[PDB]
Amino acid sequence: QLIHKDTGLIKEDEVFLGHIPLMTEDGSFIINGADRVIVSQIHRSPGV
Amino acid sequence: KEVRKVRIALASPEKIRSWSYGEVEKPETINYRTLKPERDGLFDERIFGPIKDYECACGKYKRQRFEGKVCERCGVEVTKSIVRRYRMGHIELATPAAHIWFVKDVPSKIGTLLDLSATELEQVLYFSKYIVLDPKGAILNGVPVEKRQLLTDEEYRELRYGKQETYP
Amino acid sequence: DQFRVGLARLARGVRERMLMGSEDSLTPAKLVNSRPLEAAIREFFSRSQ
Amino acid sequence: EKARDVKDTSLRVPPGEGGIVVRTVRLRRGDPGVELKPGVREVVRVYVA
Amino acid sequence: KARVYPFEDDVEVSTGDRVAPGDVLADGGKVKSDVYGRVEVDLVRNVVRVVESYDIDARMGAEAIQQLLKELDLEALEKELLEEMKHPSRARRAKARKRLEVVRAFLDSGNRPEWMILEAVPVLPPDLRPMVQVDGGRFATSDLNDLYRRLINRNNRLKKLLAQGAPEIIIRNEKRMLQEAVDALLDNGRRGAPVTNPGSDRPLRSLTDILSGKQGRFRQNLLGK
Amino acid sequence: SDPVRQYLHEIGQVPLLTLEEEVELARKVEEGMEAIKKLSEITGLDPDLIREVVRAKILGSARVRHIPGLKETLDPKTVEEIDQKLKSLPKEHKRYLHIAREGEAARQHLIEANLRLVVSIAKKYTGRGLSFLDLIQEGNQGLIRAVEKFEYKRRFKFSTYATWWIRQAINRAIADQARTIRIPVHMVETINKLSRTARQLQQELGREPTYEEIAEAMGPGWDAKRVEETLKIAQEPVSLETPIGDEKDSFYGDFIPDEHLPSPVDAATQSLLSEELEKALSKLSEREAMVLKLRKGLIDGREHTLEEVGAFFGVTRERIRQIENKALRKLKYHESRTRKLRDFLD
Amino acid sequence: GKAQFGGQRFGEMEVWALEAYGAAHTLQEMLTLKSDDIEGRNAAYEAIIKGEDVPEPSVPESFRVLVKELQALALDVQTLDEKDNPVDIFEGLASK
RNA sequence: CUCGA
DNA sequence: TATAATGGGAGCTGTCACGGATGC
DNA sequence: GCATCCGTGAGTCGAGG
Numbered sequence A: 001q002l003i004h005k006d007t008g009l010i011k012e013d014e015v016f017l018g019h020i021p022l023m024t025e026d027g028s029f030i031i032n033g034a035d036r037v038i039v040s041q042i043h044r045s046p047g048v
Numbered sequence B: 001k002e003v004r005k006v007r008i009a010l011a012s013p014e015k016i017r018s019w020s021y022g023e024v025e026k027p028e029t030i031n032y033r034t035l036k037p038e039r040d041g042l043f044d045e046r047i048f049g050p051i052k053d054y055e056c057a058c059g060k061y062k063r064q065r066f067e068g069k070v071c072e073r074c075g076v077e078v079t080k081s082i083v084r085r086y087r088m089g090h091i092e093l094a095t096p097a098a099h100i101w102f103v104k105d106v107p108s109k110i111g112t113l114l115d116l117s118a119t120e121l122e123q124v125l126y127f128s129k130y131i132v133l134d135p136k137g138a139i140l141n142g143v144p145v146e147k148r149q150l151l152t153d154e155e156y157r158e159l160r161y162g163k164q165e166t167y168p
Numbered sequence C: 001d002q003f004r005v006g007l008a009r010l011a012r013g014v015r016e017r018m019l020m021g022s023e024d025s026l027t028p029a030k031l032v033n034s035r036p037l038e039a040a041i042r043e044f045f046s047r048s049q
Numbered sequence D: 001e002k003a004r005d006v007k008d009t010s011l012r013v014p015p016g017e018g019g020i021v022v023r024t025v026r027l028r029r030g031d032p033g034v035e036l037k038p039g040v041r042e043v044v045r046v047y048v049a
Numbered sequence E: 001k002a003r004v005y006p007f008e009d010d011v012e013v014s015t016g017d018r019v020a021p022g023d024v025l026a027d028g029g030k031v032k033s034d035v036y037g038r039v040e041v042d043l044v045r046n047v048v049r050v051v052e053s054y055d056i057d058a059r060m061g062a063e064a065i066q067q068l069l070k071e072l073d074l075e076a077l078e079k080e081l082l083e084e085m086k087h088p089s090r091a092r093r094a095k096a097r098k099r100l101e102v103v104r105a106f107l108d109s110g111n112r113p114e115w116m117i118l119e120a121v122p123v124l125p126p127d128l129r130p131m132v133q134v135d136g137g138r139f140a141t142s143d144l145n146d147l148y149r150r151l152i153n154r155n156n157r158l159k160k161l162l163a164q165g166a167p168e169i170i171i172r173n174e175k176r177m178l179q180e181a182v183d184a185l186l187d188n189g190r191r192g193a194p195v196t197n198p199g200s201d202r203p204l205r206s207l208t209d210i211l212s213g214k215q216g217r218f219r220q221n222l223l224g225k
Numbered sequence F: 001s002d003p004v005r006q007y008l009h010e011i012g013q014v015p016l017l018t019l020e021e022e023v024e025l026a027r028k029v030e031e032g033m034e035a036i037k038k039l040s041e042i043t044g045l046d047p048d049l050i051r052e053v054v055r056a057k058i059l060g061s062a063r064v065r066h067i068p069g070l071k072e073t074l075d076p077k078t079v080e081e082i083d084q085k086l087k088s089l090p091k092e093h094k095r096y097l098h099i100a101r102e103g104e105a106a107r108q109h110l111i112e113a114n115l116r117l118v119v120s121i122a123k124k125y126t127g128r129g130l131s132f133l134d135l136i137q138e139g140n141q142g143l144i145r146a147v148e149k150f151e152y153k154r155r156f157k158f159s160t161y162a163t164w165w166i167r168q169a170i171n172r173a174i175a176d177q178a179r180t181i182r183i184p185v186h187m188v189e190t191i192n193k194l195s196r197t198a199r200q201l202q203q204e205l206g207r208e209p210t211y212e213e214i215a216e217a218m219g220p221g222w223d224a225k226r227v228e229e230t231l232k233i234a235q236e237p238v239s240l241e242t243p244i245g246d247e248k249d250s251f252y253g254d255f256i257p258d259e260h261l262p263s264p265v266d267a268a269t270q271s272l273l274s275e276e277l278e279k280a281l282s283k284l285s286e287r288e289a290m291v292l293k294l295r296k297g298l299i300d301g302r303e304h305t306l307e308e309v310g311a312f313f314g315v316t317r318e319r320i321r322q323i324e325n326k327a328l329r330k331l332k333y334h335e336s337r338t339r340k341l342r343d344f345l346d
Numbered sequence G: 001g002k003a004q005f006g007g008q009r010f011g012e013m014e015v016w017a018l019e020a021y022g023a024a025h026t027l028q029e030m031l032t033l034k035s036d037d038i039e040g041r042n043a044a045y046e047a048i049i050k051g052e053d054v055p056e057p058s059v060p061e062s063f064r065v066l067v068k069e070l071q072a073l074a075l076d077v078q079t080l081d082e083k084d085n086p087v088d089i090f091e092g093l094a095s096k
Numbered sequence H: 001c002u003c004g005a
Numbered sequence I: 001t002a003t004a005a006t007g008g009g010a011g012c013t014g015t016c017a018c019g020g021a022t023g024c
Numbered sequence J: 001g002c003a004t005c006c007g008t009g010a011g012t013c014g015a016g017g
C-alpha cells in the first residue's frame, strides 16, 4: 500500500514479484530442468 | 637467420607509434546489424587487417593478385587475415599516463629515480597534490618555493591566484 | 538471505522511482520493479556454490 | 555439378557412444505451448539407451 | 589581498593577465605595477586591481612526473650518488646504491626514464581479444575490449573537455579517471578497487592477469601444452 | 584513495552561489558573449577565434591546444598576434575586450559553483552500465552546455535550466556507451520501450509474456516476429573469461573452437587437390592446360575472358573457347577412366 | 575434454620428465608440431599421409601471442641473432 | 565447485 | 531547451611467509 | 636498530556441469 503523509491518500494493490523455486517432496529442487540440491553450510555461530 | 637471444626493453612513444597501423579513435566494436567492424574502432580492418584472406572490406579486391595493394574505396590492405593476430594499434592520450608497473612495483622505479616516496608519487599521479617545476620566485610562509615542492590545493591556490575571502 | 538481498535492491529501485515521476499518480505497481529480486533468486539457485 | 546452397550440419553419434533410440522430443516455433529463445526455429532431443 | 591602481586614461592590460613589478598597467605607462599579481580590470570602479600572486608552474599527474623525468641528467646523478656512496652512514650508502642500480640500469640499457610514462597506449591485435559468435549465434568477447573502451571513452571525453575550455576540477577529475583506466587496462586490481562489468563482482581480466599465475600465459601455454 | 570521495571534497571547496552572485555571473557571461560578437563586428575576425584567444588568456599558457573548428592552429604565437591586434584598439572598442575577459571568468566560476547539482542528479543513474564518475563527467558536459545557453532575463534560477541539459547529457551518455556492440539511440529507445512493455505485461499476467502478447501491447506495426528480431538484435555479448567452475578452474573461452583457420586435414586435402589437378592437367597439351588455368584462375589468381586468353595465344575467341572445350572433354574422358578426382567433389 | 574431442595436457611436470630423459626432439615435437604450430602441424599431417618424415618445427603460435601481449604492455621484446640483429618471427606481416 | 587417481 | 532542484554508499573475513618501504 | 602493512605464492592430471 502507498500512503502520502500529507494527502492521507492510500492506494493498495497486490503486485506480482516473480516466481520462487519449490522444494519437491524428497527435498530437492528442479532448476531449468535439472535436479539440484542446496547443501547446508557450517559456520561459526554469532555471539560473543 | 637463427634466433639466439631474446631482448626485452622499454618501448618509447615513437616505437609504439611505429608498431601501430592506425589509431583507434572510437570505442566501437562491430555493427549491431551487419556484424562487421566499425570504422576507427577496436576491430577495424583498416587498422588491424582483413577478416578474410586477400579480400578488402567492400569487396572490390578479392584475390592474391592484388597483394600489398590498399583498396581506395574502403582502405583495407589485400593480404592474409592472419595479420589480425599480429598488427598493433594505438590510442593517443590527451594527457600522459604512468605505466603502473613502474609505480606500484615497490620500490617504485620512477619514485626511486626522482627520489619520491610512494605516498608523494601517489599524491602527484592521482591528482591530490601539485609539484613545482618552476617556482618563478614564489613565496609560501616566508620561505621561498623550492623546486619539486609538494603543495596542497589550498597552498597552490593561495600562491597562484592569491588570498581572499567573502564575509556575509 | 539471497531473497533479502534482492528485496533490498528492489527497495533501492523503489525509492529511486519515488523521487521521479508524477507524485499524485503513483501506484505500488508503478514503483515496484521485480527484476532484481528475481535475479537474486535465480542467481542463488543457478550459480551459488 | 552446381555446388549446393546448403551443407551437412547434422547431429551424429560421438565416438564411443550409441545404442538404441528410445525417445524423441521436437519443439517447433509457431506451435501451441512453444516459444524458444530468440532466433531458434526448432529444438530436437534424442534419447539413446 | 590586492593592490589598487586607479586610471584616468586607456589601460594597457586586460583581466586575467599576469603581472610582475615594473609592468605597464595603464595611462600610457604612467601608472605601473608594484607587486607580483593577477590583473582585475574594474571598469565600474575605474581601477586596475592586482591580486597578489605568482606565475608558478606547479603541475599534477603523469604530465608533471614525465617532465621531471625528462629533466633528469643520468650521468650527473650517477656522480652525486657515487659521492653518496663514500658516506660513512651505512643507510645512506644503501639508498644511494639502490638508486644507482636503477640509474645505471637506464644508462647501460639505453632506455630513457620518461618512457615509463605513456603517451601512446598500444592496442593488442583483435584476434588476441576476439569478438566471436558462438554455437547458438550469440557473441562472446574478451574483457580487454571493455577495458580499451573505457580508456577510449575517457580519453575522447578528455579531448572534448579540453576543446571546450572546461574548468580545473573537471579536467583534473577526467585526468585522474584516465590514469585509472590505463591502470585497469594494464594491471586491474593493482591500485584501488578492481574494475568489474555491470551486474557482476568479477574483476575484468587485464593484461597482467593474462601473463602471470598458474592460469597465465607462461605456465598454461608455454611451459606446458 | 577513493576517487569519488576526493572529487566530492574538491567539489566541496567551491561555495554555493547566492541568488545575487548567480545572476551577476550569468549577466557577465551573456554580456561577454555579446562583447565577443561586437569584437567580431569591429575586427572583422572570427568570433570563434576571438573567443578562443580570450579563453586562452583567462586560462593561461598551461592550456593552449588546437580547436577542431578553428581554421588556424591555436598556438601562443597566434594568440599573441590576435591579443596584440585586440589591444591595439581605441578605448571605446577596447572596452569589449575587458567585457569578454570578465565574461569567460564568470563562465568558469559559474560552472565550478554548479558542480554539485550534477552529482545530485547523476547519483540517480547508477547501475545502468556507466560508472558514477563517468555519469558525473557527462553531466558536467551538460552543465557546460547549460551555462552557455542560459538566459538570466527570464528570472528563472540556473538550477532549473541546468537540470534539463544535465539529464540530457547523462541519458545520451548511457544510450551511447553502455553497450559493447553500439546501438543507435532511437533503437535503444525502442528496446527499452519493449522491455517496459514486457515488464508491465508480466506484472499483469503473473508470468512472462509471449512474443505475441508483447506485439499486441506494442500496437500496430508490431508482430511476434518483429519482437523476436528486436530482442535478438538487443542481445549483449558474454565474457570469454567467464568462469565455469571457480576462478582457478576454467574459462568459457576454453570451450570455443577456432572455426577460421583451416585444420591440418583441410589443408592437406587442398594440397592433394592441387597436386591431383596438376597431374590431370599434365595429360593435356601445354596450351589447353594453360587455357584452362587462365579461364579458371589458377595462374594469376583471376579468370580471364575468352578475349584475353585468345589475345594471349593469338587466336579468335571462338578458337580459344573451342580449345577450352576440347581440353575439358579430354579431362572428362581421363577422369572417367581413372576416377582420381571424384572424391574431392564432396 | 572428450566432449570437444580434446587433446591430453602435457603439463610442466611431463615436460620435466622428457627433459630429464634428454628426449629433446620428442619434447620439441610436443611443443610445436603436436601443439600450436600451425604451419608445423599442417605440414606434419600432410607429410605423414604422404609417407614422408615430419618436417622441422618452427615457432609456436603462443610465443607470438606472448610477444604481442608484452607489446600491449609497452614492452619491446626482440628475438635477435648472434650478431644482435633483430630476427622477425612474424615474417614481415606485422612490420609496416 | 563436486568427483577420480 | 526555463518552477526549483547543489557532497555516494558500499562494507562477514577462520592462512602464511617474505621483501619493503618504513616508521616507530 | 626493531615491530608494522602490503603483496604473493600455496601438486597433477583427468571427469561432471
Ligand SMILES: [Mg+2]
Residues within 6 Å of the ligand: F215, F216, F217, F218, F219, F220, F221, F222, F223
Ligand atoms: Mg501488433
Ligand SMILES: [Zn+2]
Residues within 6 Å of the ligand: B056, B057, B058, B059, B060, B061, B071, B072, B073, B074, B075, B076
Ligand atoms: Zn575495398
